[PDB]
Design a protein around this ligand. Structure first.
Ligand SMILES: Nc1ncnc2c1ncn2[C@@H]1O[C@H](COP(=O)(O)OP(=O)(O)O)[C@@H](O)[C@H]1O
Ligand SMILES: Nc1ncnc2c1ncn2[C@@H]1O[C@H](COP(=O)(O)OP(=O)(O)O)[C@@H](O)[C@H]1O
Ligand SMILES: [Mg+2]
Ligand SMILES: [Mg+2]
Lengths: 466, 460
């Protein structure tokens, strides 16, 4: 009959690699490159280190189309005791905390590792030296899919004669370079443009080398772990916060200590609206009381905004500088909005617009999407960003014709980006986010409208002379 | 400092509900409904039972927008010992076996259960009565997200005095009926049009009741568990197939017994190309030998197609009938293609085209997507099917003006549909499937050309 079984997280993604962005050899190569670059960047600028990143892709077997991808960085490294699980245990991560990072699932690199053993037989190769480490630790690893645990094939150590800090990861996978080429280059090119404090070197499978020089030695303030904002915190999150407590807080104490934007005044008001007794021990909250808290958090209209300390923005100057460098337009403008909250997570939307000049002519805007400083490249038409741009009436902001030369850019940064898939190429339809993307686009479009009404006014004056 | 931690599969989806199709209350309402209907259909037609399914959505709290979704079927039920894990352990399923079903992840209904727990306090309710059971077994359940296991709130039984056989599931969740309304109705409508042997009753939050009567009592042959096709079988899958052997097979015995489309002569060709000794014991394949086997599978050019049997198609007749019923076109045609293989899995693409008549005028085709008999409604433009339809030059097949009345329908069935997400609303870019979708569309496109040519000569 029907037979019931369970799977481990490794077997789940091994069975369904298209869920992590490994559906074909071209996209696999792209995904492997991007997960590694993202890890190296989280290991550097999140810790105040100006990134030096080296990427190499070598064709190691033309017949079988197997490529070896190697990414070397000057990050903080990884404690040797954590290396096995970091790369060989699905759903293991140092990024499950409330803080803006590129990684978030504790899936990324293991997905590439899984794809690697599914199609070839060489283990993945890791070399790492933590900050102030006397040694360089080496590993060769595979994943035991059934147990979802690391298999240490080889493990070793060498004397770190040069202070060296950082990580090298090398993984062999099926690939399709000709099909993946243009998007891999566009990925690196787009991250560089918004990361001018980093330096990249890229050697491709044909042996081309490209150099992306550091343009500034000023590093953005690192994002930090924060407490949740109360707006949108759910029932399960409340139970987690309660379970994590090491003191016998009252409900009032709980509210003031465990969240952002709650002082003694807001707290009293929340307790009253939620029908809760200030002095009750929070550990004794009932299932129904938890519900009332959550709904109260949800409908409360007077919360202060979260702070921006958990976030790292591109910023208006850089957005504008980048759009000008790439597109050489007649006009550019941008906006970094104030922080909002969704589902307890702080978030900011940034928007830019560029018009005219070297921008090609078309029937629709070129749309550049970024999430947590990652350039999104695939699945553009399923993105909530695309949904919002398409629904906006550009005619109301001066866009005359069917055909025009416009570029629209949107950056969402958050302690949590809600992607449509673990492949992280498109952003899901979360209403609070959709609304604030719309609001941001309206603010920049208003600036465009300003540029265009001046142009029309100039034209209208010159018309009289004809 | 970096602090390393682990998550259970429940915790992972509780943190990231958008990954299972729960990004907002409108889509969650929709997703909950379809996960339940699909479970009910997997529990009936896969077992030779004419499906009788009732769906009710009650608005239970206006201010909080909480809806109770209840689905009742006449399926095979669930063994009482399995109910807790079936609904309360993420990554638990009876569908991990190689066979065409609507479910496949062992996540579906539990994602709704998680979403239910995240926003309100009532537990899910299950009543079930397996075949020949003299009892109705009842449950109220939640999920312990940290442990990823069931919490049993209530559990009991009652004598089956009315002769109920099947399952009833009710879940309370935040929802948005006005936003979801048209899509829920479309999902049920399109299911019914391709499932004429099923009967549905739908009662909505406004009190409307719609009856979808059974039109035929002839069910397609139930899909069964089948052996993999060698083409695209990967290294980990080889190891699982060896690990599961009850007998000390040789590599040669392995090849002809464990796979589809491998005779004793085909095996010999493969053992030679792979450089493997026929009489070596397969339990002793080295890591490298497995590599060479898989590569050989991938490169071999003379494999028979998988068996068309044990996939369950809509069929050309039903496809055209459906198109004619919905759209009343001047012309319709369809094709059920011969089976292919991808990544070890048998699949078939079916394609339909309608033109003229009551079909609206527009600048692109209306595209109707189905996967394993499921109508796909969201994220159409990220779908591989849409990609192919968009890239086809319809000028080559007649499409004259820039404003035409055309419907294109594609159905992909397989022992495994490769979705873009566990939300299962769109098919990923798997190259073998993409090539076949294009080939299939070209076939029906030639029939359309014959019509559009045989119709211009009329105006001329
Ligand atoms: N190059 C690197 N430098 C430092 N730490 C790394 C590097 N690569 C991976 N890690 C660590 O391993 C963990 C697992 O990474 P990954 O599987 O890609 O998931 P995620 O990035 O979502 O956490 C990361 O959280 C990080 O702590
Ligand atoms: N209405 C039902 N009748 C019989 N079995 C069911 C029903 N609903 C769920 N199940 C069982 O519970 C299991 C888990 O369902 P689900 O979480 O939706 O995952 P999946 O459908 O992918 O297996 C199913 O595999 C099925 O065996
Ligand atoms: Mg990562
Ligand atoms: Mg299911």
């Amino acid at each position: 009959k029907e037979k019931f079984t369970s799977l481990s997280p490794a077997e789940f993604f091994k069975r369904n690699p298209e869920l992590a962005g490994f559906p074909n050899p071209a996209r696999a190569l792209y995904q492997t490159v991007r997960e590694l670059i993202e890890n190296s960047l989280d290991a550097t600028d999140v810790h105040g280190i100006l990134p030096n990143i080296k990427i190499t892709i070598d064709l190691i077997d033309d017949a079988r189309q197997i490529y070896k991808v190697n990414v070397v960085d000057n990050g903080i490294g990884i404690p040797p005791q954590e290396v096995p699980n970091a790369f060989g245990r699905v759903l293991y991560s140092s990024k499950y905390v409330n803080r803006q990072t590129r990684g978030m699932y504790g899936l990324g690199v293991k997905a590439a590792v899984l794809y690697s053993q599914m199609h070839q037989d060489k283990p993945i190769e890791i070399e790492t030296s933590p900050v102030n480490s006397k040694r360089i630790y080496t590993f060769k690893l595979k994943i035991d899919i059934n147990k979802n645990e690391p298999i240490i094939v080889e493990r070793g150590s060498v004397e770190n004669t040069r202070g060296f800090h950082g990580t090298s990861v090398a993984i062999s996978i099926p690939g399709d370079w000709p099909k993946a080429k243009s998007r891999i280059y566009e990925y690196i090119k787009r991250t560089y443009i918004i990361t001018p404090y980093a330096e990249f070197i890229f050697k491709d499978p044909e042996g081309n080398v490209t150099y992306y020089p550091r343009l500034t030695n000023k590093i953005p303030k690192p994002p930090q772990e924060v407490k949740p904002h109360p707006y949108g915190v759910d029932r399960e999150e409340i139970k987690i916060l309660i379970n994590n407590l090491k003191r016998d807080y009252t409900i009032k104490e709980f509210l003031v200590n465990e969240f952002q934007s709650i002082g003694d005044t807001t707290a009293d008001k929340i307790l009253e609206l939620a029908g809760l007794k200030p002095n009750k021990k929070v550990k004794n909250l009932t299932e129904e009381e938890i519900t009332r808290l959550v709904e109260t958090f949800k409908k409360y209209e007077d919360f202060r905004s979260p702070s921006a300390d958990s976030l790292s923005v591109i910023g208006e100057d850089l957005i504008e500088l980048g759009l000008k460098k790439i597109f050489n337009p007649d006009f550019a403008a941008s906006i970094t909005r104030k922080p909002k909250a969704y589902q307890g997570h702080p978030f900011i939307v940034e928007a830019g617009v560029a018009f005219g000049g070297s921008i090609p002519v078309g029937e629709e805007p070129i749309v550049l999407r970024y999430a947590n400083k990652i350039p999104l490249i695939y699945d553009e038409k399923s993105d909530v960003i695309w949904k919002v741009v398409e629904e906006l009436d550009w005619k109301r902001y001066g866009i005359e014709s069917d055909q025009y030369q416009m570029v629209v850019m949107v950056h969402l940064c958050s302690t949590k980006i809600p992607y449509k898939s673990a492949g992280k190429e498109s952003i899901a339809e979360v209403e609070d986010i959709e609304k604030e993307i719309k609001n941001a686009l309206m603010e920049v479009a208003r600036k465009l409208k300003q540029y265009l009404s001046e142009k029309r006014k100039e034209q209208e004056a010159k018309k009289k002379l004809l």
